[PDB]
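Escalated from tier 1: 16W holo job.
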Amino acid sequence: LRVGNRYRLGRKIGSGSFGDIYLGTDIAAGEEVAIKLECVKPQLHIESKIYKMMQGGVGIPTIRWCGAEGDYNVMVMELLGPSLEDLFNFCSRKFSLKTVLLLADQMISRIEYIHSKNFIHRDVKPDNFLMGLGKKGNLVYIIDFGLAKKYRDARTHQHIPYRENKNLTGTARYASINTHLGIEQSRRDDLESLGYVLMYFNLGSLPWQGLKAATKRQKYERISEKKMSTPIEVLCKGYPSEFATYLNFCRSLRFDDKPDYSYLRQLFRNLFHRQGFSYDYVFDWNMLK
Ligand SMILES: Nc1ncnc2c1c(COc1cccc(Cl)c1)nn2C1CCOCC1
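Tier 2 regenerated the structure:
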């Protein structure tokens, strides 16, 4: 089907927060793009806005067209590549310390960027980080803002109030410990989750992973119990102390606190330089023959 006048809808690729993604072609421009279709019978437009607000940031997919099409709502964005999870599998589930640091530098910046635009992601995990293709193939992109919400006012930089008794709201494997306590989620939570993702890449899997549970409720309860019984020092044993520093710093932040993104990045950059690596964007998978 021909959509938005210049786009050609192709076969389905996968799916987003609440909608199905297709590989399409910007016929006039000759570029592959990704197209999400949302029944006029709702999240596309809520995202389009959060997406056109993030416009311009590195690692933020571009929105090329937004419109109605007969019985569908249409959004077109640049076609991105494999998620970090797909690539991790592709590398026999092993990432060198250099790949982990290269990703960490970019990932921390992405989260900083979003927070500067008054939003907190709330669902930071490996599948929501994809590399770019072609000219953007060396860049880590972040997706799925279905759970993203404003945490502070544009003008009075007034921070959302503090509140507890809230149900879990993302993946429980990478959720921050306070998310598990019903505490409202803020900037510190996005960074803590990124933190688990990093150790997740170094270990191959987290200690609260693959637990044994008869019911769904008991599995979530076990994950939370385990993530609270595992000290950061035990989680990070055998790996550069910097990963532990990052995690303790995150967990320590105060609800409305502003993270020191620079310190966190430098934490890793100093280690990176001590190891003698260069920020050459040469990841493990780039070495696959
Ligand atoms: N841009 C993309 N390029 C390549 N792959 C992509 C995406 C998106 C988001 O695409 C849109 C398009 C229009 C609107 C919105 Cl919200 C999201 N998701 N995926 C994958 C689909 C399969 O499942 C895992 C993720």
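Strands lie at 2-3, 7-15, 20-26, 31-39, 63-69, 72-78, 119-120, 129-131, 140-142, 149-150.
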